[PDB]
PDB file of N, CA and C in Angstrom:
ATOM      1  N   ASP A   1       4.245   3.354 -21.280  1.00  0.00           N
ATOM      2  CA  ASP A   1       3.251   3.269 -20.215  1.00  0.00           C
ATOM      3  C   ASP A   1       3.854   2.757 -18.913  1.00  0.00           C
ATOM      4  N   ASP A   2       4.946   1.997 -18.994  1.00  0.00           N
ATOM      5  CA  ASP A   2       5.629   1.512 -17.804  1.00  0.00           C
ATOM      6  C   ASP A   2       6.696   2.469 -17.299  1.00  0.00           C
ATOM      7  N   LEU A   3       7.182   3.371 -18.152  1.00  0.00           N
ATOM      8  CA  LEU A   3       8.279   4.266 -17.813  1.00  0.00           C
ATOM      9  C   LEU A   3       7.818   5.647 -17.373  1.00  0.00           C
ATOM     10  N   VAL A   4       6.517   5.869 -17.244  1.00  0.00           N
ATOM     11  CA  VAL A   4       5.975   7.126 -16.740  1.00  0.00           C
ATOM     12  C   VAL A   4       5.357   6.833 -15.380  1.00  0.00           C
ATOM     13  N   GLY A   5       6.070   7.176 -14.313  1.00  0.00           N
ATOM     14  CA  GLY A   5       5.561   6.928 -12.981  1.00  0.00           C
ATOM     15  C   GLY A   5       5.686   5.475 -12.581  1.00  0.00           C
ATOM     16  N   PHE A   6       4.688   4.964 -11.863  1.00  0.00           N
ATOM     17  CA  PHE A   6       4.674   3.582 -11.399  1.00  0.00           C
ATOM     18  C   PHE A   6       3.371   2.939 -11.847  1.00  0.00           C
ATOM     19  N   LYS A   7       3.478   1.936 -12.720  1.00  0.00           N
ATOM     20  CA  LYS A   7       2.325   1.286 -13.332  1.00  0.00           C
ATOM     21  C   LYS A   7       1.400   0.691 -12.279  1.00  0.00           C
ATOM     22  N   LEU A   8       0.189   1.231 -12.167  1.00  0.00           N
ATOM     23  CA  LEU A   8      -0.731   0.823 -11.112  1.00  0.00           C
ATOM     24  C   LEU A   8      -1.288  -0.562 -11.416  1.00  0.00           C
ATOM     25  N   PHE A   9      -0.847  -1.551 -10.645  1.00  0.00           N
ATOM     26  CA  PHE A   9      -1.309  -2.921 -10.814  1.00  0.00           C
ATOM     27  C   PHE A   9      -2.793  -3.033 -10.488  1.00  0.00           C
ATOM     28  N   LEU A  10      -3.552  -3.629 -11.403  1.00  0.00           N
ATOM     29  CA  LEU A  10      -4.964  -3.919 -11.180  1.00  0.00           C
ATOM     30  C   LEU A  10      -5.149  -5.426 -11.067  1.00  0.00           C
ATOM     31  N   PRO A  11      -5.518  -5.953  -9.899  1.00  0.00           N
ATOM     32  CA  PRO A  11      -5.565  -7.413  -9.731  1.00  0.00           C
ATOM     33  C   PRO A  11      -6.622  -8.052 -10.623  1.00  0.00           C
ATOM     34  N   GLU A  12      -6.222  -9.128 -11.309  1.00  0.00           N
ATOM     35  CA  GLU A  12      -7.118  -9.811 -12.236  1.00  0.00           C
ATOM     36  C   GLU A  12      -8.191 -10.622 -11.524  1.00  0.00           C
ATOM     37  N   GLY A  13      -7.993 -10.949 -10.250  1.00  0.00           N
ATOM     38  CA  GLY A  13      -8.965 -11.714  -9.506  1.00  0.00           C
ATOM     39  C   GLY A  13      -9.682 -10.890  -8.456  1.00  0.00           C
ATOM     40  N   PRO A  14     -10.320 -11.563  -7.502  1.00  0.00           N
ATOM     41  CA  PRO A  14     -10.956 -10.847  -6.394  1.00  0.00           C
ATOM     42  C   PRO A  14      -9.927 -10.162  -5.508  1.00  0.00           C
ATOM     43  N   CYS A  15     -10.394  -9.135  -4.804  1.00  0.00           N
ATOM     44  CA  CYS A  15      -9.532  -8.253  -4.016  1.00  0.00           C
ATOM     45  C   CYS A  15      -9.216  -8.910  -2.676  1.00  0.00           C
ATOM     46  N   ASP A  16      -8.185  -9.753  -2.672  1.00  0.00           N
ATOM     47  CA  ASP A  16      -7.694 -10.409  -1.468  1.00  0.00           C
ATOM     48  C   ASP A  16      -6.643  -9.521  -0.801  1.00  0.00           C
ATOM     49  N   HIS A  17      -5.934 -10.067   0.187  1.00  0.00           N
ATOM     50  CA  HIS A  17      -4.882  -9.334   0.870  1.00  0.00           C
ATOM     51  C   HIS A  17      -3.725 -10.272   1.171  1.00  0.00           C
ATOM     52  N   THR A  18      -2.540  -9.681   1.304  1.00  0.00           N
ATOM     53  CA  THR A  18      -1.430 -10.340   1.970  1.00  0.00           C
ATOM     54  C   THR A  18      -0.789  -9.315   2.895  1.00  0.00           C
ATOM     55  N   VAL A  19      -0.053  -9.790   3.893  1.00  0.00           N
ATOM     56  CA  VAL A  19       0.792  -8.925   4.710  1.00  0.00           C
ATOM     57  C   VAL A  19       2.213  -9.454   4.600  1.00  0.00           C
ATOM     58  N   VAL A  20       3.064  -8.692   3.930  1.00  0.00           N
ATOM     59  CA  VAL A  20       4.402  -9.124   3.569  1.00  0.00           C
ATOM     60  C   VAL A  20       5.409  -8.310   4.369  1.00  0.00           C
ATOM     61  N   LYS A  21       6.565  -8.917   4.615  1.00  0.00           N
ATOM     62  CA  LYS A  21       7.683  -8.226   5.248  1.00  0.00           C
ATOM     63  C   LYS A  21       8.548  -7.668   4.124  1.00  0.00           C
ATOM     64  N   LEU A  22       8.334  -6.394   3.807  1.00  0.00           N
ATOM     65  CA  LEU A  22       8.987  -5.730   2.687  1.00  0.00           C
ATOM     66  C   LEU A  22      10.298  -5.084   3.114  1.00  0.00           C
ATOM     67  N   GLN A  23      11.273  -5.101   2.220  1.00  0.00           N
ATOM     68  CA  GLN A  23      12.492  -4.321   2.390  1.00  0.00           C
ATOM     69  C   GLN A  23      12.295  -2.923   1.825  1.00  0.00           C
ATOM     70  N   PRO A  24      13.195  -1.985   2.139  1.00  0.00           N
ATOM     71  CA  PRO A  24      13.127  -0.674   1.471  1.00  0.00           C
ATOM     72  C   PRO A  24      13.256  -0.768  -0.036  1.00  0.00           C
ATOM     73  N   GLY A  25      14.039  -1.724  -0.543  1.00  0.00           N
ATOM     74  CA  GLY A  25      14.205  -1.850  -1.978  1.00  0.00           C
ATOM     75  C   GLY A  25      13.054  -2.528  -2.680  1.00  0.00           C
ATOM     76  N   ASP A  26      12.211  -3.245  -1.940  1.00  0.00           N
ATOM     77  CA  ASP A  26      11.036  -3.865  -2.536  1.00  0.00           C
ATOM     78  C   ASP A  26       9.891  -2.880  -2.706  1.00  0.00           C
ATOM     79  N   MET A  27      10.055  -1.646  -2.240  1.00  0.00           N
ATOM     80  CA  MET A  27       9.030  -0.618  -2.340  1.00  0.00           C
ATOM     81  C   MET A  27       9.375   0.301  -3.505  1.00  0.00           C
ATOM     82  N   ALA A  28       8.476   0.374  -4.488  1.00  0.00           N
ATOM     83  CA  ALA A  28       8.730   1.205  -5.660  1.00  0.00           C
ATOM     84  C   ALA A  28       8.624   2.686  -5.333  1.00  0.00           C
ATOM     85  N   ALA A  29       7.689   3.061  -4.468  1.00  0.00           N
ATOM     86  CA  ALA A  29       7.505   4.482  -4.208  1.00  0.00           C
ATOM     87  C   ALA A  29       6.882   4.717  -2.842  1.00  0.00           C
ATOM     88  N   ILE A  30       7.145   5.910  -2.315  1.00  0.00           N
ATOM     89  CA  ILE A  30       6.517   6.418  -1.101  1.00  0.00           C
ATOM     90  C   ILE A  30       5.412   7.360  -1.566  1.00  0.00           C
ATOM     91  N   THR A  31       4.172   6.881  -1.534  1.00  0.00           N
ATOM     92  CA  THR A  31       3.068   7.640  -2.104  1.00  0.00           C
ATOM     93  C   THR A  31       2.716   8.844  -1.233  1.00  0.00           C
ATOM     94  N   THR A  32       2.137   9.862  -1.875  1.00  0.00           N
ATOM     95  CA  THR A  32       1.759  11.083  -1.175  1.00  0.00           C
ATOM     96  C   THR A  32       0.529  10.903  -0.293  1.00  0.00           C
ATOM     97  N   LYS A  33      -0.293   9.890  -0.554  1.00  0.00           N
ATOM     98  CA  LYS A  33      -1.563   9.761   0.146  1.00  0.00           C
ATOM     99  C   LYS A  33      -1.342   9.415   1.614  1.00  0.00           C
ATOM    100  N   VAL A  34      -2.211   9.946   2.471  1.00  0.00           N
ATOM    101  CA  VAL A  34      -2.157   9.722   3.912  1.00  0.00           C
ATOM    102  C   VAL A  34      -3.438   8.991   4.294  1.00  0.00           C
ATOM    103  N   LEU A  35      -3.342   7.676   4.481  1.00  0.00           N
ATOM    104  CA  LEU A  35      -4.465   6.850   4.910  1.00  0.00           C
ATOM    105  C   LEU A  35      -4.257   6.491   6.377  1.00  0.00           C
ATOM    106  N   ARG A  36      -5.020   7.138   7.259  1.00  0.00           N
ATOM    107  CA  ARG A  36      -4.863   6.956   8.701  1.00  0.00           C
ATOM    108  C   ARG A  36      -5.500   5.629   9.120  1.00  0.00           C
ATOM    109  N   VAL A  37      -4.812   4.548   8.768  1.00  0.00           N
ATOM    110  CA  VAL A  37      -5.186   3.201   9.179  1.00  0.00           C
ATOM    111  C   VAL A  37      -4.316   2.797  10.358  1.00  0.00           C
ATOM    112  N   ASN A  38      -4.851   1.927  11.209  1.00  0.00           N
ATOM    113  CA  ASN A  38      -4.168   1.524  12.433  1.00  0.00           C
ATOM    114  C   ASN A  38      -3.396   0.235  12.169  1.00  0.00           C
ATOM    115  N   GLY A  39      -2.064   0.337  12.167  1.00  0.00           N
ATOM    116  CA  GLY A  39      -1.231  -0.831  11.926  1.00  0.00           C
ATOM    117  C   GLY A  39      -1.372  -1.898  12.995  1.00  0.00           C
ATOM    118  N   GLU A  40      -1.497  -1.479  14.256  1.00  0.00           N
ATOM    119  CA  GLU A  40      -1.611  -2.423  15.367  1.00  0.00           C
ATOM    120  C   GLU A  40      -2.795  -3.374  15.188  1.00  0.00           C
ATOM    121  N   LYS A  41      -3.975  -2.836  14.864  1.00  0.00           N
ATOM    122  CA  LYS A  41      -5.137  -3.696  14.644  1.00  0.00           C
ATOM    123  C   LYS A  41      -4.952  -4.597  13.426  1.00  0.00           C
ATOM    124  N   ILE A  42      -4.249  -4.115  12.400  1.00  0.00           N
ATOM    125  CA  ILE A  42      -4.008  -4.961  11.239  1.00  0.00           C
ATOM    126  C   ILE A  42      -3.067  -6.101  11.607  1.00  0.00           C
ATOM    127  N   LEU A  43      -2.108  -5.854  12.502  1.00  0.00           N
ATOM    128  CA  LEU A  43      -1.277  -6.949  12.991  1.00  0.00           C
ATOM    129  C   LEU A  43      -2.096  -7.928  13.822  1.00  0.00           C
ATOM    130  N   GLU A  44      -2.974  -7.406  14.689  1.00  0.00           N
ATOM    131  CA  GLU A  44      -3.895  -8.233  15.465  1.00  0.00           C
ATOM    132  C   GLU A  44      -4.934  -8.930  14.607  1.00  0.00           C
ATOM    133  N   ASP A  45      -4.937  -8.678  13.304  1.00  0.00           N
ATOM    134  CA  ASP A  45      -5.812  -9.399  12.392  1.00  0.00           C
ATOM    135  C   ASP A  45      -5.052 -10.375  11.508  1.00  0.00           C
ATOM    136  N   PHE A  46      -3.964  -9.939  10.874  1.00  0.00           N
ATOM    137  CA  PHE A  46      -3.165 -10.851  10.059  1.00  0.00           C
ATOM    138  C   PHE A  46      -2.526 -11.951  10.899  1.00  0.00           C
ATOM    139  N   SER A  47      -1.802 -11.586  11.963  1.00  0.00           N
ATOM    140  CA  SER A  47      -1.157 -12.619  12.766  1.00  0.00           C
ATOM    141  C   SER A  47      -2.179 -13.515  13.454  1.00  0.00           C
ATOM    142  N   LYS A  48      -3.318 -12.952  13.855  1.00  0.00           N
ATOM    143  CA  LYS A  48      -4.381 -13.750  14.457  1.00  0.00           C
ATOM    144  C   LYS A  48      -4.998 -14.718  13.453  1.00  0.00           C
ATOM    145  N   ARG A  49      -5.366 -14.219  12.272  1.00  0.00           N
ATOM    146  CA  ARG A  49      -6.042 -15.052  11.284  1.00  0.00           C
ATOM    147  C   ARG A  49      -5.134 -16.101  10.656  1.00  0.00           C
ATOM    148  N   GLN A  50      -3.824 -15.884  10.613  1.00  0.00           N
ATOM    149  CA  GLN A  50      -3.016 -16.775   9.786  1.00  0.00           C
ATOM    150  C   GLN A  50      -2.810 -18.150  10.405  1.00  0.00           C
ATOM    151  N   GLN A  51      -3.527 -18.476  11.471  1.00  0.00           N
ATOM    152  CA  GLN A  51      -3.717 -19.873  11.816  1.00  0.00           C
ATOM    153  C   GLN A  51      -4.398 -20.566  10.639  1.00  0.00           C
ATOM    154  N   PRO A  52      -3.864 -21.687  10.149  1.00  0.00           N
ATOM    155  CA  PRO A  52      -4.526 -22.375   9.027  1.00  0.00           C
ATOM    156  C   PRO A  52      -5.963 -22.772   9.319  1.00  0.00           C
ATOM    157  N   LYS A  53      -6.281 -23.107  10.572  1.00  0.00           N
ATOM    158  CA  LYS A  53      -7.661 -23.388  10.955  1.00  0.00           C
ATOM    159  C   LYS A  53      -8.485 -22.113  11.114  1.00  0.00           C
ATOM    160  N   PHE A  54      -7.849 -20.999  11.482  1.00  0.00           N
ATOM    161  CA  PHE A  54      -8.532 -19.724  11.669  1.00  0.00           C
ATOM    162  C   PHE A  54      -8.245 -18.727  10.551  1.00  0.00           C
ATOM    163  N   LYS A  55      -7.706 -19.188   9.420  1.00  0.00           N
ATOM    164  CA  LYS A  55      -7.526 -18.303   8.273  1.00  0.00           C
ATOM    165  C   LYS A  55      -8.857 -17.829   7.706  1.00  0.00           C
ATOM    166  N   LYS A  56      -9.959 -18.480   8.078  1.00  0.00           N
ATOM    167  CA  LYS A  56     -11.279 -18.195   7.533  1.00  0.00           C
ATOM    168  C   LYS A  56     -12.147 -17.395   8.500  1.00  0.00           C
ATOM    169  N   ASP A  57     -11.525 -16.640   9.405  1.00  0.00           N
ATOM    170  CA  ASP A  57     -12.264 -15.748  10.283  1.00  0.00           C
ATOM    171  C   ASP A  57     -12.890 -14.606   9.484  1.00  0.00           C
ATOM    172  N   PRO A  58     -14.008 -14.060   9.954  1.00  0.00           N
ATOM    173  CA  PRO A  58     -14.565 -12.864   9.320  1.00  0.00           C
ATOM    174  C   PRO A  58     -13.575 -11.717   9.393  1.00  0.00           C
ATOM    175  N   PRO A  59     -13.497 -10.894   8.351  1.00  0.00           N
ATOM    176  CA  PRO A  59     -12.459  -9.861   8.304  1.00  0.00           C
ATOM    177  C   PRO A  59     -12.659  -8.786   9.362  1.00  0.00           C
ATOM    178  N   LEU A  60     -11.541  -8.230   9.819  1.00  0.00           N
ATOM    179  CA  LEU A  60     -11.552  -7.068  10.696  1.00  0.00           C
ATOM    180  C   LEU A  60     -11.539  -5.796   9.858  1.00  0.00           C
ATOM    181  N   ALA A  61     -12.117  -4.732  10.418  1.00  0.00           N
ATOM    182  CA  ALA A  61     -12.416  -3.541   9.630  1.00  0.00           C
ATOM    183  C   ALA A  61     -11.153  -2.856   9.118  1.00  0.00           C
ATOM    184  N   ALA A  62     -10.071  -2.868   9.901  1.00  0.00           N
ATOM    185  CA  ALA A  62      -8.850  -2.193   9.466  1.00  0.00           C
ATOM    186  C   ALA A  62      -8.240  -2.844   8.229  1.00  0.00           C
ATOM    187  N   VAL A  63      -8.256  -4.176   8.155  1.00  0.00           N
ATOM    188  CA  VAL A  63      -7.680  -4.867   7.001  1.00  0.00           C
ATOM    189  C   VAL A  63      -8.555  -4.692   5.767  1.00  0.00           C
ATOM    190  N   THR A  64      -9.861  -4.919   5.909  1.00  0.00           N
ATOM    191  CA  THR A  64     -10.762  -4.730   4.780  1.00  0.00           C
ATOM    192  C   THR A  64     -10.695  -3.295   4.273  1.00  0.00           C
ATOM    193  N   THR A  65     -10.663  -2.327   5.192  1.00  0.00           N
ATOM    194  CA  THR A  65     -10.590  -0.924   4.806  1.00  0.00           C
ATOM    195  C   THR A  65      -9.281  -0.611   4.094  1.00  0.00           C
ATOM    196  N   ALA A  66      -8.160  -1.141   4.591  1.00  0.00           N
ATOM    197  CA  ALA A  66      -6.882  -0.883   3.937  1.00  0.00           C
ATOM    198  C   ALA A  66      -6.847  -1.482   2.537  1.00  0.00           C
ATOM    199  N   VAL A  67      -7.345  -2.710   2.382  1.00  0.00           N
ATOM    200  CA  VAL A  67      -7.345  -3.359   1.073  1.00  0.00           C
ATOM    201  C   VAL A  67      -8.248  -2.610   0.098  1.00  0.00           C
ATOM    202  N   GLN A  68      -9.450  -2.239   0.551  1.00  0.00           N
ATOM    203  CA  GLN A  68     -10.373  -1.508  -0.308  1.00  0.00           C
ATOM    204  C   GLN A  68      -9.803  -0.151  -0.694  1.00  0.00           C
ATOM    205  N   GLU A  69      -9.137   0.521   0.249  1.00  0.00           N
ATOM    206  CA  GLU A  69      -8.528   1.813  -0.039  1.00  0.00           C
ATOM    207  C   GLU A  69      -7.381   1.671  -1.028  1.00  0.00           C
ATOM    208  N   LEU A  70      -6.584   0.610  -0.902  1.00  0.00           N
ATOM    209  CA  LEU A  70      -5.496   0.382  -1.848  1.00  0.00           C
ATOM    210  C   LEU A  70      -6.027   0.141  -3.259  1.00  0.00           C
ATOM    211  N   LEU A  71      -7.066  -0.690  -3.389  1.00  0.00           N
ATOM    212  CA  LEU A  71      -7.643  -0.925  -4.713  1.00  0.00           C
ATOM    213  C   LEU A  71      -8.270   0.345  -5.284  1.00  0.00           C
ATOM    214  N   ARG A  72      -8.972   1.112  -4.445  1.00  0.00           N
ATOM    215  CA  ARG A  72      -9.539   2.379  -4.897  1.00  0.00           C
ATOM    216  C   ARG A  72      -8.444   3.349  -5.318  1.00  0.00           C
ATOM    217  N   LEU A  73      -7.320   3.350  -4.596  1.00  0.00           N
ATOM    218  CA  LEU A  73      -6.184   4.185  -4.962  1.00  0.00           C
ATOM    219  C   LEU A  73      -5.633   3.774  -6.317  1.00  0.00           C
ATOM    220  N   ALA A  74      -5.574   2.468  -6.574  1.00  0.00           N
ATOM    221  CA  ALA A  74      -5.110   1.998  -7.872  1.00  0.00           C
ATOM    222  C   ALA A  74      -6.028   2.488  -8.985  1.00  0.00           C
ATOM    223  N   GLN A  75      -7.341   2.319  -8.812  1.00  0.00           N
ATOM    224  CA  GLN A  75      -8.268   2.830  -9.821  1.00  0.00           C
ATOM    225  C   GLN A  75      -8.293   4.357  -9.885  1.00  0.00           C
ATOM    226  N   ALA A  76      -8.110   5.047  -8.757  1.00  0.00           N
ATOM    227  CA  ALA A  76      -8.358   6.487  -8.699  1.00  0.00           C
ATOM    228  C   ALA A  76      -7.234   7.331  -9.287  1.00  0.00           C
ATOM    229  N   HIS A  77      -6.205   6.721  -9.870  1.00  0.00           N
ATOM    230  CA  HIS A  77      -5.115   7.459 -10.504  1.00  0.00           C
ATOM    231  C   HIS A  77      -4.830   6.804 -11.848  1.00  0.00           C
ATOM    232  N   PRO A  78      -4.889   7.551 -12.957  1.00  0.00           N
ATOM    233  CA  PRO A  78      -4.859   6.900 -14.282  1.00  0.00           C
ATOM    234  C   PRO A  78      -3.597   6.101 -14.558  1.00  0.00           C
ATOM    235  N   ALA A  79      -2.441   6.560 -14.075  1.00  0.00           N
ATOM    236  CA  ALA A  79      -1.195   5.831 -14.270  1.00  0.00           C
ATOM    237  C   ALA A  79      -0.334   5.809 -13.013  1.00  0.00           C
ATOM    238  N   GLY A  80      -0.871   6.218 -11.868  1.00  0.00           N
ATOM    239  CA  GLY A  80      -0.105   6.316 -10.651  1.00  0.00           C
ATOM    240  C   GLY A  80      -0.048   7.746 -10.155  1.00  0.00           C
ATOM    241  N   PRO A  81      -0.387   7.951  -8.888  1.00  0.00           N
ATOM    242  CA  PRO A  81      -0.370   9.299  -8.324  1.00  0.00           C
ATOM    243  C   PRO A  81       1.056   9.772  -8.118  1.00  0.00           C
ATOM    244  N   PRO A  82       1.285  11.085  -8.068  1.00  0.00           N
ATOM    245  CA  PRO A  82       2.653  11.576  -7.880  1.00  0.00           C
ATOM    246  C   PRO A  82       3.224  11.096  -6.556  1.00  0.00           C
ATOM    247  N   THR A  83       4.513  10.782  -6.567  1.00  0.00           N
ATOM    248  CA  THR A  83       5.200  10.374  -5.354  1.00  0.00           C
ATOM    249  C   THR A  83       5.669  11.602  -4.581  1.00  0.00           C
ATOM    250  N   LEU A  84       6.083  11.376  -3.337  1.00  0.00           N
ATOM    251  CA  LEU A  84       6.625  12.477  -2.556  1.00  0.00           C
ATOM    252  C   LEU A  84       8.002  12.794  -3.115  1.00  0.00           C
ATOM    253  N   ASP A  85       8.039  13.767  -4.019  1.00  0.00           N
ATOM    254  CA  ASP A  85       9.208  14.025  -4.846  1.00  0.00           C
ATOM    255  C   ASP A  85      10.435  14.245  -3.965  1.00  0.00           C
ATOM    256  N   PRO A  86      11.571  13.609  -4.267  1.00  0.00           N
ATOM    257  CA  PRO A  86      12.753  13.766  -3.401  1.00  0.00           C
ATOM    258  C   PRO A  86      13.157  15.212  -3.181  1.00  0.00           C
ATOM    259  N   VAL A  87      13.022  16.055  -4.198  1.00  0.00           N
ATOM    260  CA  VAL A  87      13.412  17.455  -4.111  1.00  0.00           C
ATOM    261  C   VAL A  87      12.207  18.361  -3.886  1.00  0.00           C
ATOM    262  N   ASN A  88      11.140  18.165  -4.656  1.00  0.00           N
ATOM    263  CA  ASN A  88      10.032  19.108  -4.686  1.00  0.00           C
ATOM    264  C   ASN A  88       8.964  18.821  -3.635  1.00  0.00           C
ATOM    265  N   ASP A  89       9.104  17.747  -2.863  1.00  0.00           N
ATOM    266  CA  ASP A  89       8.201  17.452  -1.757  1.00  0.00           C
ATOM    267  C   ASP A  89       8.913  17.262  -0.430  1.00  0.00           C
ATOM    268  N   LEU A  90      10.160  16.799  -0.441  1.00  0.00           N
ATOM    269  CA  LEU A  90      10.954  16.663   0.772  1.00  0.00           C
ATOM    270  C   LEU A  90      11.770  17.912   1.076  1.00  0.00           C
ATOM    271  N   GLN A  91      11.623  18.963   0.267  1.00  0.00           N
ATOM    272  CA  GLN A  91      12.278  20.254   0.473  1.00  0.00           C
ATOM    273  C   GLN A  91      13.803  20.120   0.469  1.00  0.00           C
ATOM    274  N   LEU A  92      14.324  19.623  -0.649  1.00  0.00           N
ATOM    275  CA  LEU A  92      15.756  19.550  -0.892  1.00  0.00           C
ATOM    276  C   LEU A  92      16.118  20.455  -2.064  1.00  0.00           C
ATOM    277  N   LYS A  93      17.423  20.711  -2.219  1.00  0.00           N
ATOM    278  CA  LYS A  93      17.883  21.667  -3.220  1.00  0.00           C
ATOM    279  C   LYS A  93      19.120  21.199  -3.983  1.00  0.00           C
ATOM    280  N   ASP A  94      19.426  19.904  -3.987  1.00  0.00           N
ATOM    281  CA  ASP A  94      20.599  19.442  -4.716  1.00  0.00           C
ATOM    282  C   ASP A  94      20.353  19.542  -6.218  1.00  0.00           C
ATOM    283  N   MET A  95      21.284  20.191  -6.922  1.00  0.00           N
ATOM    284  CA  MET A  95      21.136  20.387  -8.361  1.00  0.00           C
ATOM    285  C   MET A  95      21.190  19.069  -9.124  1.00  0.00           C
ATOM    286  N   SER A  96      22.066  18.148  -8.712  1.00  0.00           N
ATOM    287  CA  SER A  96      22.209  16.891  -9.441  1.00  0.00           C
ATOM    288  C   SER A  96      20.899  16.113  -9.482  1.00  0.00           C
ATOM    289  N   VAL A  97      20.134  16.129  -8.390  1.00  0.00           N
ATOM    290  CA  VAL A  97      18.896  15.356  -8.356  1.00  0.00           C
ATOM    291  C   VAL A  97      17.813  16.035  -9.185  1.00  0.00           C
ATOM    292  N   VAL A  98      17.786  17.370  -9.189  1.00  0.00           N
ATOM    293  CA  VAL A  98      16.814  18.084 -10.011  1.00  0.00           C
ATOM    294  C   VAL A  98      17.111  17.858 -11.486  1.00  0.00           C
ATOM    295  N   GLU A  99      18.386  17.946 -11.867  1.00  0.00           N
ATOM    296  CA  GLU A  99      18.762  17.682 -13.249  1.00  0.00           C
ATOM    297  C   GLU A  99      18.447  16.245 -13.635  1.00  0.00           C
TER     298      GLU A  99
END
């Protein structure tokens, strides 16, 4: 169950958020889904809210929408949606990678 695709994590608690500075290697996959969310407004929400006194601001729509969409994406695929295949989605033809 862990070796077929990418095991879709289902959070055991309430659907919170974090905004992390990820490396390319910390990312398991580049998903096929296209969620037209605005990164700028999410920065204007995470960086704005992360004042310890203002961490309790009412949520902005871009962050709540992104978090809800991510959780729905986790539920909406039984074991993980197909990734943008290196060969069959990025239009490559190297035999070694196909094999």
